Amino acid sequence: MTTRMYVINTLSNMHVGSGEVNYGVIANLIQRDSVTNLPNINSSGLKGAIREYFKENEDLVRELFGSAPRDEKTLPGKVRFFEANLLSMPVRSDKVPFLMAISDEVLQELITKMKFFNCEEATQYISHLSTLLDNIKTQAQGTDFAYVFDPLLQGAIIEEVSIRATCPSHIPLQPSLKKLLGDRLVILSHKYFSILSDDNHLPVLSRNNLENGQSANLWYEQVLPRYSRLYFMLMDGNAQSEYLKKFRDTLCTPSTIIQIGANASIGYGYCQISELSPF
Amino acid sequence: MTTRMYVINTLSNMHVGSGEVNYGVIANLIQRDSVTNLPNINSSGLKGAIREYFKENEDLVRELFGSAPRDEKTLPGKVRFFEANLLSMPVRSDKVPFLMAISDEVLQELITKMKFFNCEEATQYISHLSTLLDNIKTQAQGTDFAYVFDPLLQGAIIEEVSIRATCPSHIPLQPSLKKLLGDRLVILSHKYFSILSDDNHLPVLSRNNLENGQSANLWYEQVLPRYSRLYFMLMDGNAQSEYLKKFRDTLCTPSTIIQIGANASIGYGYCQISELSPF
Amino acid sequence: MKISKKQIEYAIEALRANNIITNDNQYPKVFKGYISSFGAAVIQSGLIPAIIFFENEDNDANADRHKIIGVLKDIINAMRQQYTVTDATILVSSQIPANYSMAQYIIEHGNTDQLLKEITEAAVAMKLALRMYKSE
Amino acid sequence: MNRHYLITLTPMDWFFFGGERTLDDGKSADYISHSNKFPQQSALLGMIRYQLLKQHNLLSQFPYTENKPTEKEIMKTLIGEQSFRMTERKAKSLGLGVIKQISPLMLIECKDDTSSRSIYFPLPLDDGYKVSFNETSNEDKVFYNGIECPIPNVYPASRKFFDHKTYNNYLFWCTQGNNQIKKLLSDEIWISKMQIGITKHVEEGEDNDKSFYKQEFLQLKKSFIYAFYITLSGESELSSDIIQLGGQRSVFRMEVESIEENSDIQEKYQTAAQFLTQSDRLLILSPTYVDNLKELSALCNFMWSDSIVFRNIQTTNASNFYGKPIKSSSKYHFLKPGSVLYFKQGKRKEVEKLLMDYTYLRLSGYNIYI
């Protein structure tokens, strides 16, 4: 009722514009965290996307997100959105189409942020995540690692950095951890995860503008690969129970799709928000 | 009603450039999926091609695709165009001129996309596709497989991957699945399809430029084989029903051919668009 | 396939080592065509047939076409060095012996996926590095 | 008898403190907002008042509801009448109920274990510079826009003179060491972020005329917290909760620690600052306001000082709280933490008396020196 974790689970390729000056080839770049240089979505972007989804519900938007711009009533929003951090990203493999890549440092940051925010039903999650991390560190013994949790997925190749994923047959992965971190999950060092999510490895697309067969303009766009998983913390202030319940149920309904990103008409940034479950 | 699946049946060899400097043999490469690395059409290219077809109907393109690049007023597009992912590809055979190749992972991705987006006729297609996939997994028992559903196609060879397709008599292929996935359909493992769809097995064509009979340049182009099939989602916003109905009628008319990609003057990328038929 | 500067330096050293670039920075003009055609031969014929064709020394070629295979082996060996040795790494950082011909090595060691990638990148580096010299 | 609490603020995200230029003023370039490193002490007061009525469940919720004549004096005995009105600076009492004393905001480094809290202070403007004032020979004076002043001589205290191309004491922060000063650069303590913000404006006929702004957000380093001391009477148990400290929904974790009631917080702050004292100086620890800086200049040989700007949001108990906020009638110029006043022979008690005559400011956490 105070702090709930939400997972984004993008269905398409996301482009959230950083709006910063460019030194390089890609004219349009995606947002990244200043400290970790990991892809992220600003709280303003999340609030805007969810507000646009709920725009037809005037009362719900007014109660949760607040007054519209250039409206004279000046109503603050009862809901505080926190920055969305990249949890899991798809990674090209050979045994399977892609792999769910979660780095040990992102797991540590998730545990730290769960402890800091005291997320709802996060005690068991923190305990089990810490057991997973401790077992991973025990197996790794300070060396770089790539750990899968399916016996079928052992020996998978991460193409970009050329590392083989081994299966630690002594570490358990609880079902709720599969539901959170993703299916076909590989755990690797942050050294490899940084390479897998830098500006040279995540997709770059060329885009054109044609005028009776004449190319008027040329530029390049970079996007976040689809099926990527991002987590953000929602602080539900002491608000109306009915509007909070309606908003939570609509967000968690599998029929909902939220567009966070730029290129809406060409299907960029459509996502499915899910809140943390028990365990 | 919002989300419908459209199948792209290419009538020619398609080339959708990626704008990537290869520095190797194949200077001109085709676009590939961000996560699955399968050949695809970016939704920007799809939108541009379909807009170019409908450029005569200025009202329709203004209402659906939006305002022209040079326009004092800006009008966001109402229709959402999703990227066209490869569904089935023609593979060289011996008994028949070619087979329609699909991988079990492509089928899983199709089922997942229909579940997430809830296409118009999603329920029956998901049910029958899941039954087909479960039967395939039961028959294969974790091995490499190649299954054809006509008894006359038993032992048909795939030229690029020197394997012969078996006939599992227990698995039925429903006629609507035949209409969706293509006639003379072969289902094989992800390894086989990945080898069939990599850069070394896709059709690469040599081209040159002659100046008074002397060769001036020389480059290699790769193309997506003719009669390939691709699927993409179309989500309508608050689009007017009249223009939407005209759009669907003109798009799915058998007389309608759309050019997507490059090399238009040499007949590259001419396609037909059809909706998801009721099951 | 972006330009890899380290592979370009490897290609420079290997081109000088296998007596292609003369003391004056010039090379036989036909080697340009050799490097350009090797990549196409690998792609559209197979790695083993292309290597066998370019490794042959009984050829009616205007120059010593087999020097490019030696340069390729030198670039590949240089890449095997400076490989981050760890338990998870797919790449085999084992150097190709000089007595073994390149065709035999790929025949005896049947993991072509690594060899194919290394040979393709080394050929690209070859073609890009040959342009620093005069095309006599 | 009074009860004293230590309140520590931990930032849960990027924060922002507004300066004189805000994103929607009537001035020219109202799309770039820059963030002050510290909140105003009036922001601390409003924080405490808001949380106090939050615990007692007395707020304004939506219409401009009026309060019955019991909530009125319960808010009187809870917070008082007004916000931090700088008009009543010469009032020998805090104009606020329950709350009696608020220490200047402290930069605290919490590294590991219980250990200790490293209070961080701005560098005095003469860190390693020895100032050698008038060798009394009747010659070579200065006119500081005014009356006589005896020619400061600054040497590198380690000869040459003061070279201003290598002067960087205003970019440094300092803390207690084992008999030497530990110097931390300002950019290591804080991280700056510039945000691009828009209104998507999709609709049909809206005028795209103001749909672009630039916001500056600051992030404290991981092992760094804000803290201050409070004094509360008629004990209202200030509980730990999630707070707001001003600026685009800034969220902080409030931890309330109880200290011994037989302790004034002023000499606790001065004990923290004791490691920066010199007999010939007056180190300005918190922003200092004087109605006439000419008098202060006349009472010193040097003012190695800087200027800071103050503007407060003025709101009463029966205020809108949901409309345009009536900001302070006057922008006030305070000295900067780290400024030093080099008094003449004697007259130290006189400048102390001049500084301490503002009791509202001193109680609020302003005009604190060592």
UniProtKB/TrEMBL annotation, chains A, B:
GO terms for biological process: defense response to virus. It holds the Pfam family RAMPs. Keywords: Antiviral defense. It comes from the Bacteria. Residues 8-271 form the CRISPR type III-associated protein domain. This is Type III-B CRISPR module RAMP protein Cmr4. It comes from Bacteroides fragilis. The lineage of its organism: Bacteria, Pseudomonadati, Bacteroidota, Bacteroidia, Bacteroidales.
From TrEMBL, chain C:
The keyword Glycoprotein does not apply. Its main location: cytoplasm. GO terms for biological process: defense response to virus. Keywords: Antiviral defense, Cytoplasm. InterPro entries: AF1862-like_dom_sf, CRISPR-assoc_prot_Cmr5. It is found in: Cytoplasm. The keyword Cytoplasm applies. One of its GO terms (cellular component) is cytoplasm. Belongs to the CRISPR system Cmr5 family. This is CRISPR type III-B/RAMP module-associated protein Cmr5. It comes from Bacteroides fragilis.
UniProtKB/TrEMBL annotation, chain D:
InterPro entries: CRISPR-assoc_protein_Cmr3. It comes from the Bacteria. This is CRISPR-associated protein Cmr3.
